[PDB]
Amino acid sequence: GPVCPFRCQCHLRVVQCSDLGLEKVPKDLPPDTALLDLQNNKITEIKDGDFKNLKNLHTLILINNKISKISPGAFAPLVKLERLYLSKNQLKELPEKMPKTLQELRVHENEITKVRKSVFNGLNQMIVVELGTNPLKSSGIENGAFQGMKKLSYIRIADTNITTIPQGLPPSLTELHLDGNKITKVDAASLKGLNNLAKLGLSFNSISAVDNGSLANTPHLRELHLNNNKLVKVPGGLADHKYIQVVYLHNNNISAIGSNDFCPPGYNTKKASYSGVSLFSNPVQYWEIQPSTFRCVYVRAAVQL
Amino acid sequence: GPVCPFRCQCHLRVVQCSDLGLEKVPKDLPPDTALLDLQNNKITEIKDGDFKNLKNLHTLILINNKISKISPGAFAPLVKLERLYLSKNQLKELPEKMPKTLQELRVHENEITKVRKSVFNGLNQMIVVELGTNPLKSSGIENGAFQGMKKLSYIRIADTNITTIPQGLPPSLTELHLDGNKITKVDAASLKGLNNLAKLGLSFNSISAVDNGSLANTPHLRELHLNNNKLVKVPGGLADHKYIQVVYLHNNNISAIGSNDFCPPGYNTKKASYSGVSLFSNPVQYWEIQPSTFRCVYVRAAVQL
Ligand SMILES: *[C@@H]1O[C@H](CO)[C@@H](O)[C@H](O)[C@H]1NC(C)=O
Ligand SMILES: *[C@@H]1O[C@H](CO)[C@@H](O)[C@H](O)[C@H]1NC(C)=O
Ligand SMILES: *[C@@H]1O[C@H](CO)[C@@H](O)[C@H](O)[C@H]1NC(C)=O
Ligand SMILES: *[C@@H]1O[C@H](CO)[C@@H](O)[C@H](O)[C@H]1NC(C)=O
Ligand SMILES: *[C@@H]1O[C@H](CO)[C@@H](O)[C@H](O)[C@H]1NC(C)=O
Ligand SMILES: *[C@@H]1O[C@H](CO)[C@@H](O)[C@H](O)[C@H]1NC(C)=O
Numbered sequence: 001g002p003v004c005p006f007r008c009q010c011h012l013r014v015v016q017c018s019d020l021g022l023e024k025v026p027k028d029l030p031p032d033t034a035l036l037d038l039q040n041n042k043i044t045e046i047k048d049g050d051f052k053n054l055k056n057l058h059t060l061i062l063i064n065n066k067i068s069k070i071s072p073g074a075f076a077p078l079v080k081l082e083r084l085y086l087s088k089n090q091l092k093e094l095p096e097k098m099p100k101t102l103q104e105l106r107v108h109e110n111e112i113t114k115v116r117k118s119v120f121n122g123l124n125q126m127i128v129v130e131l132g133t134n135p136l137k138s139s140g141i142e143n144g145a146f147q148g149m150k151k152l153s154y155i156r157i158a159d160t161n162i163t164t165i166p167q168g169l170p171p172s173l174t175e176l177h178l179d180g181n182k183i184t185k186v187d188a189a190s191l192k193g194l195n196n197l198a199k200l201g202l203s204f205n206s207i208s209a210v211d212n213g214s215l216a217n218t219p220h221l222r223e224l225h226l227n228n229n230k231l232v233k234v235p236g237g238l239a240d241h242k243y244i245q246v247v248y249l250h251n252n253n254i255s256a257i258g259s260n261d262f263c264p265p266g267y268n269t270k271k272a273s274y275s276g277v278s279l280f281s282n283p284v285q286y287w288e289i290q291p292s293t294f295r296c297v298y299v300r301a302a303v304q305l
Numbered sequence: 306g307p308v309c310p311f312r313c314q315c316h317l318r319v320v321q322c323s324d325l326g327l328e329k330v331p332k333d334l335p336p337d338t339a340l341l342d343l344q345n346n347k348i349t350e351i352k353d354g355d356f357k358n359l360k361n362l363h364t365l366i367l368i369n370n371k372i373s374k375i376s377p378g379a380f381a382p383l384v385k386l387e388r389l390y391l392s393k394n395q396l397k398e399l400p401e402k403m404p405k406t407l408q409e410l411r412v413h414e415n416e417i418t419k420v421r422k423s424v425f426n427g428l429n430q431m432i433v434v435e436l437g438t439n440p441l442k443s444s445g446i447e448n449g450a451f452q453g454m455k456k457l458s459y460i461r462i463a464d465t466n467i468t469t470i471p472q473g474l475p476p477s478l479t480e481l482h483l484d485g486n487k488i489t490k491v492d493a494a495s496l497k498g499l500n501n502l503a504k505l506g507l508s509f510n511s512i513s514a515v516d517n518g519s520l521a522n523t524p525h526l527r528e529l530h531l532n533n534n535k536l537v538k539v540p541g542g543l544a545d546h547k548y549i550q551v552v553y554l555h556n557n558n559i560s561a562i563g564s565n566d567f568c569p570p571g572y573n574t575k576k577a578s579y580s581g582v583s584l585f586s587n588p589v590q591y592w593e594i595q596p597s598t599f600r601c602v603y604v605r606a607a608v609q610l
Pocket of ligand 1: 133134135136159160161
């Protein structure tokens with residue numbers, strides 16, 4: 001006989017237990033539960049028995065609890081789990097042995113200091129990972145830690161203590177968001193192999209330089225946000241890059257702008273047209289840029305000086 | 306041309322924009338969006354244009370923002386909205402003119418001080434309402450404020466400042482949860498007409514007495530939680546009530562227990578059997594209760610002394 005905990009609402013394969021101050025995961029829940037919402041409670045840990053007989057559960061929300069420890073494989077019995085939301089908790093590290101069906105993991109606002117490559121081995125259905133707002137440091141991220149996710153399309157590590165782009169990122173990535181960290185430079189090695197990367201967010205960091213060859217490793221990149229950093233000049237490779245269309249560089253320390261910083265010498269029919277370029281809040285003024293600098297842009301609205 | 310905001314993920318009619326520090330609701334979202342997640346951002350208000358062309362949106366999550374004002378009818382254009390989650394914000398009152406399709410509203414942990422009967426007029430699809438953790442006072446709740454919801458099945462006002470059960474509750478109610486408030490007494494008037502009420506949670510309040518005739522107004526009540534209150538004796542009407550099965554009275558100030566406090570004189574075949582009764586953490590001891598007191602209970606496990 002399955003029971004709905006007192007105060008929780010159990011309707012249509014949805015078990016709603018938010019805002020109840022629960023101190024641990026309820027048991028004896030309906031075997032067919034598809035979505036379990038345990039948000040805003042006082043759960044301190046996930047024990048090995050906590051999720052038994054929840055074989056149809058595709059979504060688990062544990063956002064805003066006080067979780068400081070999760071037994072290895074505690075989520076394993078959730079053979080159909082696609083979304084796991086552990087944001088706003090007190091995790092010290094990511095949970096080991098998670099369902100191989102997992103498509104999205106969010107562990108925003110925790111106390112992560114180490115990202116073991118082992119937690120991600122085999123998770124081949126994973127497409128989105130959000131690990132922002134953690135005291136994590138670049139040293140805490142094992143190299144190739146995310147390599148195991150052959151389908152990963154999006155990853156975001158924001159407002160943490162990392163200082164360099166993680167090495168060994170899965171080549172399936174289309175979006176890499178590292179806004180609001182403490183990155184100081186962009187090395188070509190970290191972006192090596194990201195042939196599918198379309199968006200690269202590096203805004204609000206402390207970047208002072210972008211090695212030549214960097215953007216060339218992301219040949220199909222369409223959006224580059226580097227605003228609010230410490231750049232002394234526009235990153236190189238924009239003129240010979242063929243797919244870049246959006247380049248945000250406002251709020252930096254760019255001294256001057258070369259004639260071929262964005263457009264190549266002769267018109268290149270193969271280079272995609274720029275749809276947006278931002279340069280305001282920089283030392284350079286509109287009067288220090290030769291009108292020829294944006295000769296490959298055919299919309300005045302695009303360039304914002 | 307619909308756009309997915311930078312850093313948000315837009316996949317399968319789901320727009321995911323949690324944890325991005327956004328300062329306002331994004332516009333130009335895909336017209337077919339069914340679920341919009343704006344949790345954990347910095348949105349301060351909902352303007353009248355914020356939700357245009359989101360006609361298929363059945364779920365809106367704005368949990369954990371800094372919302373302090375919502376224009377009247379701002380949610381009106383969401384003609385198919387079934388769930389609205391506004392918990393963890395800074396609302397001073399509930400929003401006027403909400404979609405008539407609304408099935409669930411959660412405004413837990415806000416700064417609600419007044420519940421106008423007008424916000425709920427016409428919301429005939431509403432089945433669940435959670436208004437816990439607000440500085441709300443009994444005076445701030447207009448009488449019959451919830452009357453307008455002819456399908457309301459569950460309502461919860463917990464950890465607030467109310468001191469009396471709200472008057473004029475919809476008779477469709479099956480669950481009334483008022484745990485953790487400052488209620489001092491249970492008057493029969495407030496429970497008048499609740500012929501469908503199955504569960505009544507009044508735990509963790511300051512109740513010192515239950516008027517006779519109270520439980521008789523909830524003739525089909527199956528669960529009564531009155532633990533952690535200031536009761537001087539078991540509430541009356543339990544013996545002649547026919548459906549009550551669970552009566553939690555632990556952590557009170559009950560002096561003694563009468564012979565017919567739970568069971569009527571002669572065995573009543575029409576009275577449902579008790580499946581759970583709690584009396585521990587009270588002045589009375591197991592040796593002050595005549596064994597005849599629970600003569601209509603046929604499971605020793607039921608009574609917890
Ligand atoms: C970075 O780590 C230090 C300790 O090493 C900590 O004090 C600081 O809060 C962290 N920064 C962030 C924003 O996580
Ligand atoms: C980057 O390449 C450009 C070639 O256009 C060159 O002028 C510049 O000095 C290079 N950066 C350095 C210092 O390696
Ligand atoms: C900008 O660069 C100049 C040298 O090129 C340096 O002196 C100055 O401190 C920089 N401004 C910033 C970002 O503080
Ligand atoms: C009750 O209201 C008072 C002000 O009238 C406030 O100080 C107090 O925090 C409120 N109690 C709760 C738990 O909301
Ligand atoms: C409640 O009803 C009982 C009848 O069993 C009676 O003994 C009691 O005095 C009544 N409470 C009061 C004081 O109204
Ligand atoms: C319990 O009731 C007695 C009188 O019946 C009273 O003196 C005492 O203060 C009460 N205990 C509590 C709940 O403080």
